[PDB]
Amino acid sequence: EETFFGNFDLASLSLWLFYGFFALLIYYLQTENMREGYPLEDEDGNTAANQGPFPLPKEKTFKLQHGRGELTLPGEDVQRRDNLALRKTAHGNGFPMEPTGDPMLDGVGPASWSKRRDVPELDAHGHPKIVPMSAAEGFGVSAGTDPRGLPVMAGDGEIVGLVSDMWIDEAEQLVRYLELELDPEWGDGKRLVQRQMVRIKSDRVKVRSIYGKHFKNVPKTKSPNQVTLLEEDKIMAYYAGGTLYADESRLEPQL
Amino acid sequence: GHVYANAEVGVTCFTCHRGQAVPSEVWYRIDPVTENTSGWASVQNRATSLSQFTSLPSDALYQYLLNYEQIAVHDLESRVETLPGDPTWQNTERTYSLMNYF
Amino acid sequence: MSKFYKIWLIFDPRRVFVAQGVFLFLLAAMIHLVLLSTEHFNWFELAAANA
Amino acid sequence: MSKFYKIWLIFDPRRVFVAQGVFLFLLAAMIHLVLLSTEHFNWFELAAANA
Amino acid sequence: MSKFYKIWLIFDPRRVFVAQGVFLFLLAAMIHLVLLSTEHFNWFELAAANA
Amino acid sequence: MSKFYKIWLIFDPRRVFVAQGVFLFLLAAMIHLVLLSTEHFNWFELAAANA
Amino acid sequence: PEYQNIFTQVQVQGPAELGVDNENNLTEERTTGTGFSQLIGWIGNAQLGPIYLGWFGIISLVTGTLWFNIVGFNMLSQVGYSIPEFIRQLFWLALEPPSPEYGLRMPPLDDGGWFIIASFFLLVSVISWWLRTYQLAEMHKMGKHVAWAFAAAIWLFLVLGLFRPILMGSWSEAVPYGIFPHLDWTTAFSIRYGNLYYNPFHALSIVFLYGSVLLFAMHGATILAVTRFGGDRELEQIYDRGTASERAGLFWRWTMGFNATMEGIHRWAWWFAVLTPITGGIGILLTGTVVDNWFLWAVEHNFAPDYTQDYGYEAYTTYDGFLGR
Amino acid sequence: ALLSFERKYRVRGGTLIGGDLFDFWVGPFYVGFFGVTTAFFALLGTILIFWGASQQGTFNPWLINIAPPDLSYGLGMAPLMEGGLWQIITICAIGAFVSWALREVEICRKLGMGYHVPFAFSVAIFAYVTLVVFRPLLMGAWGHGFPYGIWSHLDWVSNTGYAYLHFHYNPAHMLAVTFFFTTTLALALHGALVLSAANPPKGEEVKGPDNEDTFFRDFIGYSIGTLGIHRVGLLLALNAGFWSAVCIIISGPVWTKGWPEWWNWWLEMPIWP
Amino acid sequence: DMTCTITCWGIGVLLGIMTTVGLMVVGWSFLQGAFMGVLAWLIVGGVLAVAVCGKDNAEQIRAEMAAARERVRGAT
Amino acid sequence: DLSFTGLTDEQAQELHSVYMSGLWLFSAVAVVAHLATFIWRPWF
Amino acid sequence: DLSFTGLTDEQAQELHSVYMSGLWLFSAVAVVAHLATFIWRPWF
Amino acid sequence: DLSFTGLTDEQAQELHSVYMSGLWLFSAVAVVAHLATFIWRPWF
Ligand code: BCL
Ligand code: BCL
Ligand SMILES: CC[C@H]1c2cc3[nH]c4c(c3C)C(=O)[C@H](C(=O)OC)c4c3nc(cc4[nH]c(cc(n2)[C@@H]1C)c(C(C)=O)c4C)[C@@H](C)[C@@H]3CCC(=O)OC/C=C(\C)CCC[C@H](C)CCC[C@H](C)CCCC(C)C
Ligand SMILES: CC[C@H]1c2cc3[nH]c4c(c3C)C(=O)[C@H](C(=O)OC)c4c3nc(cc4[nH]c(cc(n2)[C@@H]1C)c(C(C)=O)c4C)[C@@H](C)[C@@H]3CCC(=O)OC/C=C(\C)CCC[C@H](C)CCC[C@H](C)CCCC(C)C
Ligand SMILES: COC1=C(OC)C(=O)C(C/C=C(\C)CC/C=C(\C)CC/C=C(\C)CC/C=C(\C)CC/C=C(\C)CC/C=C(\C)CC/C=C(/C)CC/C=C(\C)CC/C=C(\C)CCC=C(C)C)=C(C)C1=O
Ligand code: HEM
Ligand SMILES: COC(C)(C)C(=O)C/C=C(\C)CC/C=C(\C)CC/C=C(\C)CCCC/C(C)=C/CCC(C)CC/C=C(\C)CCC=C(C)C
Ligand SMILES: COC(C)(C)C(=O)C/C=C(\C)CC/C=C(\C)CC/C=C(\C)CCCC/C(C)=C/CCC(C)CC/C=C(\C)CCC=C(C)C
Ligand SMILES: COC(C)(C)C(=O)C/C=C(\C)CC/C=C(\C)CC/C=C(\C)CCCC/C(C)=C/CCC(C)CC/C=C(\C)CCC=C(C)C
Ligand SMILES: COC(C)(C)C(=O)C/C=C(\C)CC/C=C(\C)CC/C=C(\C)CCCC/C(C)=C/CCC(C)CC/C=C(\C)CCC=C(C)C
Ligand SMILES: COC(C)(C)C(=O)C/C=C(\C)CC/C=C(\C)CC/C=C(\C)CCCC/C(C)=C/CCC(C)CC/C=C(\C)CCC=C(C)C
Ligand SMILES: COC(C)(C)C(=O)C/C=C(\C)CC/C=C(\C)CC/C=C(\C)CCCC/C(C)=C\CCC(C)CC/C=C(\C)CCC=C(C)C
Ligand SMILES: [Fe+3]
């Protein structure tokens, strides 16, 4: 085989062509990932002077099922929160924020939730996706330990009530939530706990994220037979906020 | 040039024989190792006493250390015009088996 | 042309300035390095030889 | 020329200062290192040879 | 030159101080290590040779 | 020089003391090990060679 | 400690799911009969089956079975039809490619005919499977990304088996059908043509393989980390952004200065995985046809390292000193 | 410059050590105690590498080579030009990797999520430490580590592989290669399925998890689910790393002869006639 | 009833170790004994888990449960 | 009046004055160093 | 006054006094140790 | 007036005074050390 000029042959041509293609592909991949969260803002809520070297992409349209309309991105932020109880700890940018009231009750920090749609998620048939186990026909426990009837222990060793039901995902045959009936001392009504934050034992179910006194302020569902995306977000994040805000020692340095 | 390579080391009867009438590590010809095979498929794909626990050709030690066949397989330029009769990867495998034996 | 000021109605000055700033330094470094890789224009070796 | 001060209506000084400092330190380090890879201007070896 | 104090209206000391603290120690450590890797300025081998 | 006490109006002493202690102990350990890694100053080996 | 979501605490079982349908009538070809495995339910889904039986699938199954049986019976006959010896030497037998002397002509059955027949069957089976994977996506109303990613690997498959032997003008350039023989072929191919390390496209394919493994590790860890916010339901997060996506993006933005979206990370994963066989096939296709020695190519192109020290054990130690005498 | 949803997450707390002394951001990056340590170690290592490159006589990225000492120095320290710079850079790299992992831990704690990512990074750190620390320590010399060069760290791999005659016959190498290939295939399939579900042909509605489940049950007769696939991928990657470490660590200090000969236990079982 | 299955798996592991040591005693090597021991582990553990742990606890529920399937059959 | 950073004209002038004041000092120190180095070992 | 930590002027002065006393004691001990080491085995 | 950090003019002047006071002491110590090192082993 011969060379076109100097040491340049077919392999070098292929290598340079691949270099060009890879550069274009990297540009495309980076630009495709800027459809959420832009343009950038400063710490006062205003548009920043610097926006980066990659310009914004063009628009694309999603056609959603069940007649819920269309979604076009990039666009305005419809999940934006309105009034946040936060305070700046400095006059410039690059410094943390300070909660104004109760961070667990105000939904800030690790307890933050997003403003999702106030409608339940639907399966292929158009039914609510997550349903209590007492309304699902033909479903039963096949393995593991049944948590129904067991007492619930909080993060500080307090028993707050019993597990009364489970909320399952009928389409995927997976358990999503555990329902809890509270003792009159610790509150009233029923509360939901996501399955990812519980440890089922032979005689008890333990929730280490929050303490006993934090159980009465868990967000409640409006309907007893379904839950919406907004409620799931608020319930699930309230439970996540306790890993930091349930005690003063969880926030200060461990050393 | 080989036995006196580094010092005065010779050879006697007690180098192949070690008290035996037959010196150990003598070899024979076992080239057909499979059945219903004709060419390159009739010498390698089996673990035998001449292959060193591999599937490499057992035809070695007979084409090289008894007959006079080429061992080199490499090309001496980055780009070379390939012709029929040039070494292939099968000759490379027979050399790999010889060097495993070494 | 007298009307070459309309390029700033098509392009954003900030991105252009950043890209040009990178480009100029890269070009200058490449040219100096290409000069250093020869024999007639390497000033370090020329200074060494004349000493 | 008398209007070069209008560059700060386009670029934020806080980012420009950091970028300029990083660039200047890197350039100085690169030059000081390039001088040490030769024999005529390597001051450590020259000090060794003159003693 | 008499208005250099205005840099503190641009930068908060809480970040500049830590940046400078890291930079100075990095510089000192590299310089000492670079000195330790030569033959004319290595003060550990000099003591052994002198004794 | 007489107003160096204002450094505690910028940094929290509680979070500075721990870092200072860690830095000092690590530096001392590094220097002792560096001394141990040589031949002239390895006090464990001079004890054996002397006797 | 906290629950880590690696094994499921309690399982539930309901009526079996038969599958969605549309006017294309997918039901007419699906089988009837399902099972449940509690052992697998600790990790993933427990339902097993049903499967879709088209014509491409049946053709592929039959033809691949024919290839398997041909290879197995040839290997069995090569040993004398001895079952204990067939079991003993299973990893060492193979079905060898033809001899170099026959060029591209059809060789005798003893020296490569069965190899060609089995290769033809294997090619037919693979193409049938690809057609099936295209047809299924066409009938469920979905994109054809799965077909493209399979075609990415089929490209390297064909380059290793079909295109390169034709370009080199010999059927002896293929790969033998065996466990240890195919590794032997890999090593011999690497040795014969210089060093395959210095082939730039082998390096590029290695880069993309490492990146793909790293990216799945990162993505699996990230998704399991934010699963307490319903992060495993990725499609609903794409359609309606929640807090899980925001936290997952902010983690990587604070870690390395840039992040992705819930839909854009899958594009990254698809491309890193697909780019490996493409570069590998491009690099393999150039060996022998264009470049015959890759170390000499590297030396001529000035990226081969140079060493100053000497060679041999006598430059560093003594034979008696090594033994301790 | 923040994202439009980032400000409410930028709160204080969640530090293992340091409190508010280093609790701030520099651009997008988060700074802490371990960020400071990482910056120091990485900068020192890079500058030392370029100093060694300058003293070598070349600045070509392809040709820079920093090598470990000779085998005669044992486990002691070597002159900084004859391989001591390699030891210093190794120490710096270990420190930087550990600091990076702990910074990831701090970020995870602040965001209120799980600690899976640092645990996954720990396996790669373990593999690197096995390559540069454990195996040379067992073999008895720091000269068994690989050099720090782009093209010179492949010659080491080649020579180490050929030191056992045929490294493809190593069973742990087989396991690791199989895990690597399986991980790549699983990643490709997962990405393709998600992208196809979210991007239908023009004029068609988007799909859901039920559609994906049906597709793979029609395709191969089984579906792992939207949650099991991530577990499977994570486990595959971790297993690949672990078995790579095992394969490299058994080659030198445990086995000494060629790898093909290891199969004589199977080839010489008493059950065979 | 996963505990019984884990117990059966542990019994299989112990039996594999015992068989491996016995094979050392007979005169085999380490790997030759280990392969047969692993075989024994998987086979005996699987057999015990399927058989013994398949006897789920029931005294009179089993009979009516057995009798119930004797009525579904015969008319289908 | 164009402004992307939110500054005023007078603020920009006052900033540029001090910026150039520092730049000239940096350049003067560099020039003195270069002169001393050239006196020590020439390159031209 | 300016304070990012919450301390006052008097408290900062009081803290700095004790900090400097400890620093001086540490420096004196280090100086004595260095002098003894130099007498035992002199570098430079 | 331009102020990104929220400080006033007098506070910035005081801060600069203390910073320069520290810098001069650092530089003086470095100069003394360099003079001693040059007397011990010259590099010019
Ligand atoms: C003659 C050559 C021999 C051979 C000899 C060897 C030897 C010898 C080795 C293996 C190793 C491996 N072999 Mg093998 N191997 C051969 C050919 C093959 C073939 C093939 C023919 O197809 C395959 C598929 C493989 C594949 C493999 C993997 C199983 C394994 C790679 C380790 C790994 O990925 O750990 C990945 C882990 C890491 C080391 C990652 C470390 C990352 C660190 C922690 C972070 C980096 C930070 C960085 C500096 C940041 C800076 C960047 C900033 C942005 C600036 N081998 C041939 C047959 N093989 C290697 C192995 O198992 O190593 C343990 C090894 O050493
Ligand atoms: C001594 C060995 C040589 C070497 C020789 C080779 C050779 C030769 C090759 C590789 C190739 C590769 N090398 Mg290399 N390589 C070496 C050292 C290494 C090392 C290392 C030391 O760590 C690494 C990391 C690797 C790894 C790699 C990969 C990057 C690459 C494989 C591409 C791929 O996607 O494979 C994945 C495999 C495939 C996609 C194959 C196609 C699969 C098809 C689709 C199968 C169809 C299904 C089937 C018919 C049905 C089965 C039955 C079912 C159960 C129904 N090499 C050394 C230097 N390397 C390949 C390459 O591309 O290099 C350019 C290649 O050919
Ligand atoms: C890596 C992907 C490859 C693959 C995977 C694959 N196929 C699978 C599975 C998996 C992981 C199953 O779990 C499922 C199965 O039933 O496995 C036992 C199956 C399957 N894929 C099949 C075929 C098949 N797949 C193919 C494709 C592939 N298989 C891919 C290439 C091909 C090819 C290449 O042509 C064929 C021929 C079927 C045999 C089966 C579809 C299941 C079905 O239609 O009915 C099964 C259901 C039952 C009637 C009862 C369960 C079956 C049990 C074996 C009996 C009882 C066991 C008990 C209920 C629990 C099982 C215990 C577990 C440990 C399994
Ligand atoms: C992006 C590149 C990666 C990749 C991708 C990839 N592979 C793919 C795909 C994709 C996207 C598919 O869609 C396709 C698939 O079906 O995946 C589930 C496939 C596939 N890649 C496969 C293998 C494979 N991929 C590999 C690698 C890779 N593929 C790359 C890493 C490798 C290697 C060497 O690393 C291999 C060996 C198959 C599992 C499958 C292709 C299936 C196929 O072509 O089947 C044809 C049919 C036959 C040959 C008939 C076989 C008959 C048998 C004798 C019996 C029936 C099968 C049975 C299930 C096995 C035995 C079971 C026992 C219990 C009896
Ligand atoms: C679904 O979910 C998911 C997401 O979401 C939706 C995701 O997104 C992702 C993420 C995935 C992707 C984005 C895909 C792309 C990813 C890859 C291809 C992986 C490979 C990545 C890379 C090659 C890039 C990685 C880059 C690295 C590690 C380098 C970056 C680091 C630095 C520049 C330094 C770090 C900064 C520190 C430590 C802070 C600074 C230190 C201090 C002490 C501050 C003090 C001040 C100073 C020192 C001075 C000022 C400092 C400056 C300016 C810093 C710069 C300094 C320099 C010297 C240059 C995944 C997986 C996911 O599943
Ligand atoms: C164990 C694996 C070995 C491998 C992979 C290997 C590889 C090779 C290869 C490929 C060649 C031919 C090179 C060419 O084409 O020019 C060769 C030849 C040679 N090798 Fe090695 N070798 C090995 C071991 C050894 C050992 C241990 C010796 C010991 C003395 C050795 C000595 C030689 C000699 C003398 C030649 C020249 C043969 C000739 O051209 O006549 N090799 N080796
Ligand atoms: C020898 O063989 C090898 C392969 C090695 C070769 O070397 C092969 C080489 C080739 C095949 C080469 C081929 C080269 C070409 C085809 C070259 C073509 C080049 C051009 C068409 C160049 C066009 C350049 C145009 C320019 C410079 C335009 C400038 C315009 C402006 C500066 C004005 C910008 C416009 C404004 C501001 C619009 C006003 C705005 C308003 C809002 C009104
Ligand atoms: C963290 O952020 C902030 C802003 C707070 C900072 O930046 C803070 C920074 C600090 C707190 C920094 C602190 C720094 C120190 C405490 C530094 C101390 C330095 C020394 C004590 C240095 C001593 C150096 C001594 C040397 C080099 C001695 C050399 C001796 C010889 C070479 C022997 C030969 C002697 C001869 C020939 C005698 C002749 C001498 C003559 C002077 C003529
Ligand atoms: C030889 O070949 C090779 C490639 C090896 C080379 O070595 C090539 C090298 C090059 C090509 C090098 C090129 C180098 C350059 C182009 C360098 C340019 C450098 C500059 C322009 C530097 C400018 C620095 C200016 C400074 C530091 C000025 C002032 C700073 C300050 C005054 C700081 C204080 C600021 C205040 C107070 C402003 C606040 C004011 C208010 C009113 C708020
Ligand atoms: C040779 O080359 C290499 C690289 C190998 C090197 O070895 C290089 C080495 C270096 C470059 C080393 C550099 C070292 C330094 C810069 C070291 C600096 C050290 C210090 C500045 C140390 C300071 C120590 C201060 C101390 C100990 C102060 C106080 C201690 C107290 C116990 C006081 C307690 C205070 C109280 C109680 C206050 C309470 C008051 C109230 C009002 C509540
Ligand atoms: C030779 O080649 C190679 C590459 C090898 C090199 O070695 C290259 C080397 C270089 C290129 C080196 C370059 C070096 C520099 C540019 C160094 C610069 C150094 C400085 C500018 C140092 C500044 C130090 C300043 C200090 C120490 C100031 C103050 C310290 C204080 C402790 C004061 C603290 C202030 C307070 C408390 C104010 C509080 C006031 C209130 C009102 C609250
Ligand atoms: C007899 O006993 C029974 C019945 C139990 C059996 O049947 C036993 C069977 C066995 C024990 C079987 C064992 C089988 C193996 C160990 C098989 C191993 C197979 C491989 C490693 C195969 C690799 C194949 C291919 C490779 C590596 C690359 C590329 C190949 C191709 C592209 C093939 C395609 C061929 C083409 C396109 C050429 C066709 C020719 C034409 C003229 C069209
Ligand atoms: Fe995913």
UniProtKB/TrEMBL annotation, chains C, D, E, F:
Gene Ontology CC annotation, any one: plasma membrane
Annotated organism of origin: Dinoroseobacter shibae (strain DSM 16493 / NCIMB 14021 / DFL 12)
Residue sites binding bacteriochlorophyll a per the record: A28, H32, W43
Protein name as it appears in the record: Antenna pigment protein alpha chain
Record's keyword terms, sorted: Antenna complex, Bacteriochlorophyll, Cell inner membrane, Cell membrane, Chlorophyll, Chromophore, Light-harvesting polypeptide, Magnesium, Membrane, Metal-binding, Transmembrane, Transmembrane helix
Residues annotated as transmembrane: 16-36
Coiled-coil boundaries: none
UniProt GO molecular function: bacteriochlorophyll binding; metal ion binding
InterPro entries: Antenna_a/b (IPR000066), Antenna_alpha (IPR018332), Antenna_alpha_CS (IPR002361), Light-harvesting_complex (IPR035889)
Domain called Antenna complex alpha/beta subunit: residue spans: 5-44
SUPFAM superfamilies named among the record's database cross-references: Light-harvesting complex subunits
Xref: NCBIfam families: pufA_517_ASD
UniProt-annotated location(s): Cell inner membrane
TrEMBL record, chain G:
UniProt gene name: pufM
Membrane topology note: Multi-pass membrane protein
Main location: membrane
Protein name: Reaction center protein M chain
Binding positions for bacteriochlorophyll a 2 per the UniProt entry: Y197, H202
Chain residues that bind bacteriochlorophyll a 1: H182
Keyword Magnesium (UniProt): yes
Any single GO CC term annotated in Swiss-Prot or TrEMBL for this entry: plasma membrane-derived chromatophore membrane
Protein family membership: Belongs to the reaction center PufL/M/PsbA/D family.
GO molecular function: bacteriochlorophyll binding; metal ion binding
Keyword Magnesium among UniProt keywords: yes
Residues that bind Fe(3+) 1: H219, E234
Keywords: Bacteriochlorophyll, Chlorophyll, Chromophore, Electron transport, Iron, Magnesium, Membrane, Metal-binding, Photosynthesis, Reaction center, Transmembrane, Transmembrane helix, Transport
Domain of life, source organism: Bacteria
GO biological process: photosynthetic electron transport in photosystem II
Binding site for Fe(3+) 2: H219, E234, H266
Complexes and interactors: Reaction center is composed of four bacteriochlorophylls, two bacteriopheophytins, two ubiquinones, one iron, and highly hydrophobic polypeptide chains.
Subcellular localization(s) per the UniProt record: Cellular chromatophore membrane
Segments crossing the lipid bilayer: 51-70, 114-134, 146-167, 203-226, 268-291
From TrEMBL, chain H:
Superkingdom of origin organism: Bacteria
Protein keywords: Bacteriochlorophyll, Chlorophyll, Chromophore, Electron transport, Iron, Magnesium, Membrane, Metal-binding, Photosynthesis, Reaction center, Transmembrane, Transmembrane helix, Transport
Binding residue positions for bacteriochlorophyll a 3: H168, H173
Ligand binding (bacteriopheophytin a 1): W100
Name this polypeptide is given: Reaction center protein L chain
UniProt-annotated location(s): Cellular chromatophore membrane
GO MF entries: bacteriochlorophyll binding; metal ion binding
Positions of bacteriochlorophyll a 1 binding: H153
Keyword match Metal-binding: yes
GO annotation, biological process: photosynthetic electron transport in photosystem II
GO CC terms in record: plasma membrane light-harvesting complex; plasma membrane-derived chromatophore membrane
TM helices/strands, residue ranges: 29-53, 84-102, 114-134, 174-198, 232-255
Protein topology in the membrane: Multi-pass membrane protein
Binding site for Fe(3+): H190, H230
Function summary: The reaction center is a membrane-bound complex that mediates the initial photochemical event in the electron transfer process of photosynthesis.
Pfam families xref list: Photo_RC (PF00124)
Annotated positions binding bacteriochlorophyll a 2: H168, H173
Positions that bind bacteriopheophytin a 2: F181
TrEMBL record, chains J, K, L:
Binding site residues for a bacteriochlorophyll: H16, H34
UniProt cross-references to Pfam families, sorted A to Z: LHC (PF00556)
Record has Membrane as a keyword: yes
Gene of this entry: pufB
SUPFAM superfamilies reported in the protein's UniProt record: Light-harvesting complex subunits
Organism: Dinoroseobacter shibae (strain DSM 16493 / NCIMB 14021 / DFL 12)
Summary of subunit composition and partner proteins: The core complex is formed by different alpha and beta chains, binding bacteriochlorophyll molecules, and arranged most probably in tetrameric structures disposed around the reaction center. The non-pigmented gamma chains may constitute additional components.
Compartment(s): Cell inner membrane
Protein name listed in UniProt: Antenna pigment protein beta chain
Similarity annotation: Belongs to the antenna complex beta subunit family.
Positions that bind bacteriochlorophyll a: H34, W43
NCBIfam families reported in the protein's UniProt record: pufB_517_ASD (NF040862)
Membrane topology: Single-pass type II membrane protein
Keyword terms of this UniProt record: Antenna complex, Bacteriochlorophyll, Cell inner membrane, Cell membrane, Chlorophyll, Chromophore, Light-harvesting polypeptide, Magnesium, Membrane, Metal-binding, Transmembrane, Transmembrane helix
UniProt cross-references to InterPro entries, sorted A to Z: Antenna_a/b, Antenna_beta_CS, Antenna_beta_dom_sf, LHB-1/5, Light-harvesting_complex
GO biological process, alphabetically ordered: photosynthesis, light reaction
Membrane spanning residue stretches: 18-40
Organism lineage string: Bacteria, Pseudomonadati, Pseudomonadota, Alphaproteobacteria, Rhodobacterales
Listed GO MF terms: bacteriochlorophyll binding; metal ion binding
Domain Antenna complex alpha/beta subunit: 9-44
Function per UniProt: Antenna complexes are light-harvesting systems, which transfer the excitation energy to the reaction centers.
GO CC, any one term: plasma membrane light-harvesting complex
